[PDB]
Amino acid sequence: KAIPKDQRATTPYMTKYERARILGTRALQISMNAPVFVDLEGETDPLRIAMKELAEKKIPLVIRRYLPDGSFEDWSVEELIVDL
């Protein structure tokens, strides 16, 4: 049922599951010749590339976190802090 960009009580940090699903989702696109958003300083491996995009905060994706009751928060891969 959505929650305003303010009032999100969920973690500002990205969960290890989100990192894995985003990296896997992005890697799949890269593996199907989908446009890339960074400078492949040699990388030719999709996942390895996707990992580079993440580090460079250039993955235009949004994670919709659901709460047990149905409501939900929306964070952008951009926002999410990546420390694991």
Q: Which of 22, 27, 30, 50 binds other proteins (CB under 8 A)?
A: 22
78 binds other proteins (CB under 8 A): yes
For residue 78, CA distances in Å to 32, 33, 55, 74 come to 23, 23, 10, 11
Q: Which of 45, 26, 28 is nearest to 37 (CA)?
A: 26
Smallest distance from other proteins to CB 45, Å: 19
For other proteins, the binding residues (CB under 8 A) are 1, 7, 9-11, 13, 15-18, 20-22, 24-25, 58, 60-71, 73, 76-78, 83-84
